[PDB]
Design a protein around this ligand. Structure first.
Ligand SMILES: O=c1ccn([C@@H]2O[C@H](COP(=O)(O)OP(=O)(O)O[C@H]3O[C@H](CO)[C@@H](O)[C@H](O)[C@H]3O)[C@@H](O)[C@H]2O)c(=O)[nH]1
Length: 482
């Protein structure tokens, strides 16, 4: 039986007609929090992962049946606040005239032409992103618009922000919509389960789901991973990348060792169990451990494969929920207004489901399956010539890079927001394919047709006037200044 605060959350969520699967999932988290769970995972509690299988080693492709039983879902529900976005990130342009959505739709169109005619495609939208996404598709891809509401969109849940003082639901008279937030992308499982969509998918014969970040345009179906999951009877698979210097916003793989004591004269066998640690779960006093890319060198791509019938079985057998570890995220009710009440927002990360299945694994993938965009520094690298468009409409790092993205460092005073970054490339995106690292300090504007090679720094000490670069400039292993 629940605390008074937890009952106040149930009542609020029921009055608003929140899905019961979501209420159950949230309340189980609310119980954890009220007992002192923060989501924190300290370094002393985990150990690094030393060896995994690699996609580059695999060669066998899955038969057509398996391919036909796969569904593709793109996450599209978050708000990239750090980039100063008030709408769906996937609408920003990534190449001249084309948005993340554009390439996403082109990926689906191509796959339907060349691999599986009846590929099921889904987008997980939220309150904050559904509107703009649907009208975009209405204009450019009517074949998706026709079945948007019918089979494309999965709407994610909203859960109450809770006051830190009491764990009660927050009230915000000035704008009650701010009392609610989407509960991270680990909600995909809840939303699929609670809407009946997961059982429908299983009923129609689908067996696998391939999920990836909306911002990652290298993530598509690779039939060798499906063959691999079939052979090895794997129910959940996380693709990880060898971590680079640019991999600082996200989570890394880790392991624990659980001892299953062996019966009948067979000794207790240590058995590895895998887990995800998001940056938000690192005790912030230990961030340097989280950020040491040698210690934890397997970075989650969020390219995730789920065996749908087993996910469904597992959630049925855990009270109609998937008990992902809660992440207790701290904010104010109006995140803009730091005079507003402090709240917790309970969230989960979908890659945390690796701890949920007995035969969950991770596989190392090459960097051409991971081109993330968390910051405008990423968007600069993606927009430039360091990233190329494949025939099947993935963006991938050019071969010259040897799987190392150009290390982009933009002054956060000027380029952290989208409006500032937009002026930086006002007159052109620099050629970056040959740039191992570009650092921009102070207010600066690229010219047209700039070529950067080696380690280039552009610096303006003056901090008043823009340092503008002349068309044609080619900076090589240098620091450029007014
Ligand atoms: O409630 C939410 C929150 C996010 N998203 C979407 O989910 C994707 C991921 O969000 P993002 O904030 O971009 O990334 P992070 O959550 O920080 O990190 C994810 O992606 C990283 C790699 O890029 C992995 O390392 C992390 O483990 C994984 O959690 C994006 O498409 C968001 O729009 C939602 O749909 N709903």
């Amino acid at each position: 039986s629940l605390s008074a605060a937890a009952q106040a959350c149930v009542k609020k969520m029921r009055d608003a007609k929140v899905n019961e699967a979501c209420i159950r999932t949230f309340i189980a988290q609310h119980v954890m929090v009220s007992k002192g769970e923060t989501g924190s995972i300290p370094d002393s509690a985990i150990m690094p992962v030393d060896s995994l299988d690699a996609l580059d080693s695999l060669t066998i492709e899955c038969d057509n049946a398996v391919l036909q039983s796969t569904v593709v879902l793109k996450l599209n529900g978050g708000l990239g606040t750090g980039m100063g976005l008030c709408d769906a990130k996937t609408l920003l342009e990534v190449k001249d005239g084309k948005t993340f959505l554009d390439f996403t739709a082109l990926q689906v169109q191509y796959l339907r032409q060349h691999c599986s005619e009846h590929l099921r495609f889904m987008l997980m939208d939220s309150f904050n992103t559904s509107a703009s996404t649907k009208s975009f598709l209405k204009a450019r891809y009517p074949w998706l618009y026709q079945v948007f509401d019918s089979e494309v969109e999965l709407m994610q849940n909203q859960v109450p922000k809770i006051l830190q003082d009491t764990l009660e639901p927050a009230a915000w008279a000035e704008n009650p919509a701010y009392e609610w937030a989407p509960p991270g992308h680990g909600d995909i499982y809840t939303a699929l389960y609670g809407s009946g969509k997961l059982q429908e998918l299983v009923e129609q014969g689908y067996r696998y789901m391939f999920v990836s970040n909306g911002d990652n345009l290298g993530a598509t179906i690779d039939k060798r991973v499906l063959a691999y999951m079939e052979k090895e009877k794997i129910d959940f698979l996380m693709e990880v990348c060898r971590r680079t210097e640019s991999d600082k916003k996200g989570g890394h793989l880790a392991r624990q060792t659980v001892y299953v004591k062996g019966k009948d004269g067979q000794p207790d066998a240590e058995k590895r169990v895998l887990l995800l640690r998001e940056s938000a779960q690192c005790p912030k006093a230990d961030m340097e451990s989280f950020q040491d890319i040698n210690k934890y060198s397997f970075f989650n791509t969020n390219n995730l494969w789920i065996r749908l019938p087993v996910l469904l079985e597992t959630m049925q057998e855990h009270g109609g929920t998937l008990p992902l570890p809660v992440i207790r995220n701290e904010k104010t009710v109006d995140s803009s207004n730091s005079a507003s009440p402090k709240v917790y927002q309970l969230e989960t990360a979908m890659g945390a489901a690796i701890a949920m299945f007995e035969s969950a694994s991770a596989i190392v993938v090459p960097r051409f399956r991971f081109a993330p965009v968390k910051t405008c520094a990423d968007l600069l690298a993606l927009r430039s010539d360091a990233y190329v468009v494949t025939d099947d409409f993935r963006l991938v790092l050019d071969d010259r890079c040897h799987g190392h993205p150009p290390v982009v460092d933009l002054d956060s005073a000027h380029y952290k927001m989208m409006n500032g970054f937009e002026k930086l490339v006002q007159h052109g995106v620099p050629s970056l394919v040959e740039c191992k690292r570009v650092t921009v300090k102070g207010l600066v504007q690229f010219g047209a047709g700039n070529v950067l090679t080696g380690t280039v720094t552009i610096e303006n000490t003056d901090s008043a006037s823009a340092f503008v670069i002349p068309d044609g400039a080619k900076l090589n292993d240098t620091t450029a200044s007014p």
